[PDB]
Every structure is written in structure tokens, then in C-alpha cells.
């Protein structure tokens, strides 16, 4: 029989699927919408928790903090719901309304920060709740907590090589906290010794944050659209020597390459899903790539964001 | 390897997830939003289109029309999309600005119909445009195609059967165009033999016409607030004589069951999904279902009705 326990075991072996009218016929889309709360944070959502409770940090009585309302909270409130604990979000007071319903029904507590202050202002207000009582409160910490690369180094990563039989030469991953694109490349390159695969990271032309360390240059953010990458800083949970090549993408490559997965080949997708495609696309305009077969992450779906520009004058 | 040709291919295989706060541990829920437009209705709408391809009536050239606007509209919009054919909805122009956007991003021709006319106008409209010319358009009829329940008998039936290895004792259902009952029944009780199965279909006590056909009393429909079941007469993919059992629930009772799942559970659901729910709720009051293994079917997720009073009140 396979009955799940709770909704947080079932994440992962999402699908593989070839495109036919984007590209060249040689783009295989790893579909991260196909989980329990519909984006590539389900995975690790269930296995920071898990890892928690496996290092004896997490049991009744603690709570969970962690500054974030984009897919992590989704993802944190439902594994939070399915297991039993008690979960705090702190987010800017400007956030939707749309948003805040959604995590409120999977039963988390919102703790609304200033304005005016942005995301340093959530982070700030974590921190204070958690120092309060830090046998209490227990924060998650996304971008540095190795259980986020870990869960796709032992989920995606995997998957990816059983679904191509080894056949995948590109692999292509926009960067958040950077966890799939270190986890992934780190079985691949790593545990099945395939170190002639090309690692591409993906970030906001905007906002190359990636392309300037690499170079030694000076980190300098700006804003942008790409909703879920480019966070303006170098993540603990990215290992800046498995990466290849930077390709940097604009909002408007994104948003009309997102669209073109929806209508041209029924995907919903997201702006970062968009984004990622965009860049093979880029890549299969130079001879030497046109014979691989390139794997992309499509990190979350359309649906999530009918309210951005992503929808705007469609009719 | 295990690369899909297109989308309409990795539809199934959902999860079955036992619930552990709602019931007393032995309802077994199978998540339907696991799918790849994220409904029970993706099964049928890949079913519909390729059982008229194998019939010869759809091919390049000849355009879909249907009339609806709810699951079954996404779904055969993103299997049109995948394999390339062009689809026409109608509905009425009252529809959501919200489910408007989504069909449209995924290239359905929208034509909207006078909103004084309901279902039954836009239902009207796509008889019309059908008639203009019969050998250029083809209209599916969910309610009526017998490649509806025929994908259940395929995979949603087989599915349950497997994952449970045959220890299923009730089978419950909310009844929309009855495919996923008659389908899953006629697999189990049909060709797996178990003729003690306990179907139940459920339906809104506010339109009770399932009850009132089983009584061989007069239909008589009325308004509801279940989304996606209780259609008002009795479909021609639903056969009354695989049914064991009729309950009828009502909007308060679905909506505070739907979310329980969310908050007590982490699965994300629609209204009818609190409903299939609450009547498995209700037999176990009954000593005779004590110790019987229940198997309900949750048709989408409650992120499709963010504007609904699913979420009403939160704060
Ligand atoms: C998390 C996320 C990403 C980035 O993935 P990481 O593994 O964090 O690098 C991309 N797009 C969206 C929508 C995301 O939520
Ligand atoms: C289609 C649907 C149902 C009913 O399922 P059928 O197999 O048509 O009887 C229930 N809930 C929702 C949300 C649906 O879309």
C-alpha cells in the first residue's frame, strides 16, 4: 500500500517535460509546482522541519519563526499545519491581502512589521521574538539552514538523473536562496561524477549580484520583477564554485517567455519560470549548445500571481 | 527514462493521505489538485480530447468549443495548448476577471454570453456557434461524454485500489458530472469484484435532486454555495444504481470542514472538498462505519477560491 502519514511526505518526483514550440525540441522543463503546496519550497519546507526534529531542536512546545511571506511560508505553514506545531510569520504590513488569507487558512500567526521598513524590517522583528525566549522559538533561517540544499541533492537531483538515464548535459537553475542549483549540481557533478555538466545560474539583469562576485567586482543590487530570485546577495546556501555560467535576464525577457509557456505549451508558470526558460533559449543561439539536451527548473505557477504584471492587459 | 511528450501526459497518481485530527484516523483523503492544471478535471479534459483523436472527430483544422468556465475550462484549455488544438469557451459575462485572465493565458478563445442568462445561455451560445459549422467545430459535453468516467475506470479507480492493496471499505464522492463515482465504482465493485463496497455520493442539502430521483420524487434543484458539485438534474455519466448511499451536506458544514483540512491537516482545499469531508465525518457517527477504512476524493485547492467566502473572515 502507499497511504502518506501527513502531506509533508509527499513532495518531490515531480515531472519532466519536453517542450515542443519554445526552443529547439532539446529544453526538458522539471515541473516544482506538482508538490503539496505548489512550488519547489515544499521540499524544503518539510526537511528543515524534519531536520529539526532528527537534531532534537524541534519537539512540542517550540515554536517556529521565520521572516518570509513569498513561497517558504506557504510551504513552512502547511508542514507546520500537517505536523502539529505552532508557526509565526513576520512580514512588511504592505503585503497582500491575497497573501496573508492564504497563510492565515493553513493556521500560521502574522506578525506585520513597518512598511516603510522592507524585509530588514521583518528579519528585525524575528529576531527580537526569538531572543525573547530562545528556548521557545526556533528560526528556520532559509538562506543558510543546510537542510535546504540537502533535501535536493537527496530529492530533485536524483530525480533528474533517473528521468534523463544520465543523458542531461545543461542544467539550468534561477537562484533565491541557491539551494537547488547546489544540491542538484552537487549529486550530479559530485555523487555521479558527471563534472563535464554545465551549471547555469540564472538572476536579474538588474540585479547581478552573481556575475559581480564571480568577477570580483563590487556587489551591487538594484530592484526588479523576477518575483522568488535575485535577493541581492550572496546566499550562504549557494556554492558560488559549481556554477558555470551567469546569465542575466530582464523582466520583460521573463514575463513574455511565461507567457509563452502558458499558451504555447499549457504550463502554468511563474516569472522566475519564465526567466529560466528565457536564459535556454539565450544559450541555444550558440552553436556549441546546439546538440544538448538542457534540463530547467519551473520553480512555482501562474495561478500564485494573477494580481502582478505577469496577467497585465491580456485583453 | 521517464520524459512526457507533452502536459496532458503526467496527469494521475495522486497521493492518498491518511487525515489524523479529522475523523478518527481512518479517512483516507486522495489529493486531486496533484495534477497538472491542479484539479480532478485534468484527468478528463487529457481523456476527452485524446479519445476524439482515436475516433478520427478531432484533428488539425477542427476547433473545440465547450461551455464552462470552472476545472473542466482549465483543463481542456491547458490540453489544448499541449497538443496544439484551438478551443472556444463560453460562458457568462459575469465570469471572474480573475478565471478570465487564467484561461486566457492559457490561449482559450473566450466568448461571453448574457449575464441575465446563466449556464443556460452560455450553453445556448455554443450550440450556435457549433451549428455554424458542424465539420469545423467539435463540442466535448462533460456531462454527457462517456471518456469522463471511462479515465477514472483507467486510473483513478486502479489508483485506489492499488495504494490501499484492496483494503478499501467506503468509496465517497461529491457528484459533479458523476464521472469520478461511476468510473472508481465500476472498477472496484465491477472488475475487481468487491460487490460489498459502500459508495456514497454527496450533494448539497440545498438541492438535494440525487436524493429526490433515488425516491422517485420530483427533482427540484436550488442554489448552493458548493462549488464544482450539485449541477441540478442528474448527469448522464452518473449511473444511480452504483450508489449505496446519498448525504446531503450544507454550505456552513463544507466550508468549516474545508477548513479544518487546511489548518488541521496542511492540505490545501476547495469547498467541495470540505463537503466530501464532512459527510465521511457524519457515518462515522453510525457504530457500523466504526471500524471501516473510508476513501474520499478532494477535487481542487482552496488557492483557486481565494475570493470566495472559503476565506472570508480570516482576521
Ligand atoms: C525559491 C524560488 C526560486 C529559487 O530557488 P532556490 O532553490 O531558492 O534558489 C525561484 N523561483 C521561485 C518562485 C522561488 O520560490
Ligand atoms: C468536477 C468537480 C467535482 C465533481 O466531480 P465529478 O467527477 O464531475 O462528479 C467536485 N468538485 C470540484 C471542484 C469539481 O471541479
Redesign the interface.
Known amino acids: 500500500?502507499?497511504?502518506?502519514?501527513?502531506?509533508?511526505?509527499?513532495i518531490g518526483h515531480t515531472?519532466?517535460?519536453?517542450l515542443?514550440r519554445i526552443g529547439n525540441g532539446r529544453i526538458?522543463a522539471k515541473?516544482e509546482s506538482?508538490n503539496?503546496?505548489?512550488s519547489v519550497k515544499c521540499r524544503i519546507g518539510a526537511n528543515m522541519i524534519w531536520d529539526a526534529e532528527k537534531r532534537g531542536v524541534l519537539k512540542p512546545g517550540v515554536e517556529l519563526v521565520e521572516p518570509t511571506n513569498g513561497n517558504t511560508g506557504i510551504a513552512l505553514?502547511?508542514?507546520?499545519?500537517?505536523?502539529g506545531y505552532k508557526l509565526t510569520l513576520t512580514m512588511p504590513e504592505t503585503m497582500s491581502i491575497?497573501r496573508?488569507?492564504?497563510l492565515?487558512?493553513?493556521?500560521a500567526n502574522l506578525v506585520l512589521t513597518e512598511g516603510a521598513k522592507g524585509m530588514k524590517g521583518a528579519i528585525q522583528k524575528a529576531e527580537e521574538i526569538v531572543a525573547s525566549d530562545p528556548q521557545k522559538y526556533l528560526l528556520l533561517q532559509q538562506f543558510s539552514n543546510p537542510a535546504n540544499p540537502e533535501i535536493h541533492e537527496k530529492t530533485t537531483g536524483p530525480e533528474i538523473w533517473?528521468?534523463?538515464?544520465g543523458?542531461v548535459d545543461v542544467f539550468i537553475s534561477g537562484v533565491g536562496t541557491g539551494g537547488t542549483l547546489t544540491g542538484v549540481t552537487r549529486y550530479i557533478k559530485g555523487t555521479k561524477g558527471k563534472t563535464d555538466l554545465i551549471t547555469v545560474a540564472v538572476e536579474p539583469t538588474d540585479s547581478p549580484v552573481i556575475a559581480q562576485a564571480l568577477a570580483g567586482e563590487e556587489i551591487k543590487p538594484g530592484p526588479h520583477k523576477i518575483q522568488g530570485i535575485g535577493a541581492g546577495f550572496i546566499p550562504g546556501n549557494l556554492d558560488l564554485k559549481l556554477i558555470d555560467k551567469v546569465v542575466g535576464i530582464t523582466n520583460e525577457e521573463a514575463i513574455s517567455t511565461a507567457?509563452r509557456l502558458?499558451?504555447?505549451?499549457?504550463?502554468?508558470a511563474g516569472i522566475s519560470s519564465g526567466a529560466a526558460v528565457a536564459a535556454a533559449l539565450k544559450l541555444q543561439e550558440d552553436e556549441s549548445f546546439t546538440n544538448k539536451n538542457i534540463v530547467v527548473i519551473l520553480p512555482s505557477?501562474?495561478?500564485?500571481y494573477?494580481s502582478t504584471a505577469?496577467?497585465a492587459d491580456?485583453?
Chains 1, 2 share one sequence.
Not at 500500500?1 to 509527499?10: A, G, H, R, V
Not at 492565515?104 to 493556521?107: H, S
Not at 502558458?262 to 502554468?268: D, R, V
Open positions: 500500500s502507499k497511504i502518506y502519514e501527513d502531506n509533508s511526505l509527499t515531472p519532466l517535460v519536453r515542443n526538458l515541473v506538482r503539496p503546496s505548489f505553514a502547511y508542514v507546520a499545519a500537517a505536523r491575497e496573508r488569507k492564504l492565515k487558512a493553513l493556521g533517473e528521468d534523463t538515464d543523458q507567457r502558458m499558451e504555447e505549451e499549457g504550463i502554468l505557477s501562474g495561478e500564485r494573477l505577469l496577467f491580456l485583453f
